[PDB]
Write a protein that holds these residues in place. Sequence first.
Motif, PDB file in Angstrom:
ATOM      1  N   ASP A   1      41.576  50.600  49.364  1.00 58.80           N
ATOM      2  CA  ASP A   1      40.507  49.683  48.838  1.00 58.80           C
ATOM      3  C   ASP A   1      40.125  49.400  50.793  1.00 58.80           C
ATOM      4  O   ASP A   1      39.099  48.566  49.920  1.00 58.80           O
TER       5      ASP A   1
ATOM      6  N   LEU B   1      37.011  46.176  49.512  1.00 61.69           N
ATOM      7  CA  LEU B   1      36.997  45.020  50.404  1.00 61.69           C
ATOM      8  C   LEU B   1      36.058  44.966  51.072  1.00 61.69           C
ATOM      9  O   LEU B   1      35.825  43.676  51.875  1.00 61.69           O
TER      10      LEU B   1
ATOM     11  N   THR C   1      33.320  41.355  51.343  1.00 62.79           N
ATOM     12  CA  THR C   1      34.296  39.892  52.324  1.00 62.79           C
ATOM     13  C   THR C   1      32.593  39.933  52.935  1.00 62.79           C
ATOM     14  O   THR C   1      32.213  39.014  53.910  1.00 62.79           O
TER      15      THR C   1
ATOM     16  N   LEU D   1      36.379  39.126  44.279  1.00 62.13           N
ATOM     17  CA  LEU D   1      38.296  39.468  45.365  1.00 62.13           C
ATOM     18  C   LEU D   1      39.436  39.055  44.543  1.00 62.13           C
ATOM     19  O   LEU D   1      40.488  39.244  45.178  1.00 62.13           O
TER      20      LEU D   1
ATOM     21  N   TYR E   1      41.097  41.156  42.308  1.00 62.14           N
ATOM     22  CA  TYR E   1      41.817  42.571  42.895  1.00 62.14           C
ATOM     23  C   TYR E   1      42.791  41.707  43.359  1.00 62.14           C
ATOM     24  O   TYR E   1      44.029  42.239  43.256  1.00 62.14           O
TER      25      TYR E   1
ATOM     26  N   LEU F   1      41.861  38.011  54.440  1.00 60.06           N
ATOM     27  CA  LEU F   1      40.872  38.813  54.344  1.00 60.06           C
ATOM     28  C   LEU F   1      39.988  38.682  54.936  1.00 60.06           C
ATOM     29  O   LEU F   1      40.229  39.956  55.469  1.00 60.06           O
TER      30      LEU F   1
END
Length: 405
Positions: free
Chosen positions: A164, A168, A172, A191, A194, A237
């Motif tokens: 992933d 990601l 970001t 996001l 997910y 994250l």
Amino acid sequence: NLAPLPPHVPEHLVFDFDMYNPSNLSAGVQEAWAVLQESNVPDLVWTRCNGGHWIATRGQLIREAYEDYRHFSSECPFIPREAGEAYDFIPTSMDPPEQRQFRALANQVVGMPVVDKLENRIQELACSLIESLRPQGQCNFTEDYAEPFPIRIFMLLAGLPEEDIPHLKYLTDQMTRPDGSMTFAEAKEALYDYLIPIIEQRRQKPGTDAISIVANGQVNGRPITSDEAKRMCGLLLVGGLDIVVNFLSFSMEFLAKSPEHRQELIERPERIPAACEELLRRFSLVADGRILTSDYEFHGVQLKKGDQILLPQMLSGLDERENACPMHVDFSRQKVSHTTFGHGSHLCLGQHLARREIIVTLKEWLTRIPDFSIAPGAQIQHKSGIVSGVQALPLVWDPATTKAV
Ligand code: HEM
Ligand SMILES: CC1(C)[C@@H]2CC[C@@]1(C)C(=O)C2
């Protein structure tokens, strides 16, 4: 694209700086931002770019405003406004006292004790990655180390599949350095799309990962809601996948360019922790802001409720009043002043993790590859945003000069 100057902004305070595409970006992003600290620039200015907003250019003002959450709220911390309004990450989008309970939980998942138990793994990962590059005599540092190293450690912490990462990483980046590919709100929604299923499972069948800890945590003596967990995990994250990655590139770019600075650390490694502090000051890379909760006269300037003000954490340590010869890198600086990790109630919760990742990198790299430089003919490109970064960093070295450790 400049917005119409508001009625309360004096024309002499206008300085159209665009945080998403500063001028002398060719001289380096930190150098590009430092134009705001020139003699011909007031301490507080208004830029008509990105919708129009204020910018505090001095460490004194930046620190002051960060301590005063009464007037400077973090409910709308991103520019442009559309972004700040959609911003709902916990605990940053909250002002005291409400923010306090969440900071404690977050510290449970990324705090010092957690990093401590992970030390051997962080070390092994750095050594493994470096050793595999050593014989090549070259690499694109950003994608060969800067990205895999911090990102793999966090995916480990959060218990998320390496499969992933690409998704990601892309999301970001959209949030901190908009590509135009999608709005902040849109990237945030993806996001969250997910994260929701993951939080649901972790809540039913909880593991020992950070997401499981946050998802089944308690705040204010009661259970954290699914929504709160989601908003906190989203911030963790973004913070863990996007910042250290870019900071490592800025630091390595400089070390690849200064042999004397490399030698200093090679001969006196006990000076590395100190060197880390100076690099964090010189290559500070974060810049977000606050929103005025009411009309307010800040240092003689009339601020209006709803006005947004950018308080660049990166500029404080570059301010000449805070550190002599701010642009010069001096590992023996006795007083390294900076707000790289924030100031006020929102002080960075991942400082320990970041420092260890930076320190381990510097130590293990200079141990095996003491001599290296930027591939000649390479033009290092920087990117400006909430979190500034480096596009690519092509490095080269003579394998005969490296040491397998
Ligand atoms: C060199 C790397 C890093 C830098 C320079 C940095 C910088 C910052 C800054 C300046 C803030 C304050 C934002 C504001 O006041 O609006 C912040 C907040 C925060 N950072 Fe870091 N950070 C770094 C790495 C990390 C990492 C590794 C994590 C871990 C996942 C992280 C998690 C957080 C969290 C959760 C907050 C929110 C604290 C609160 O609102 O109370 N950061 N960081
Ligand atoms: C401004 C930040 C660097 C801080 C940690 C990640 C970040 C992008 C936020 O939204 C809060």
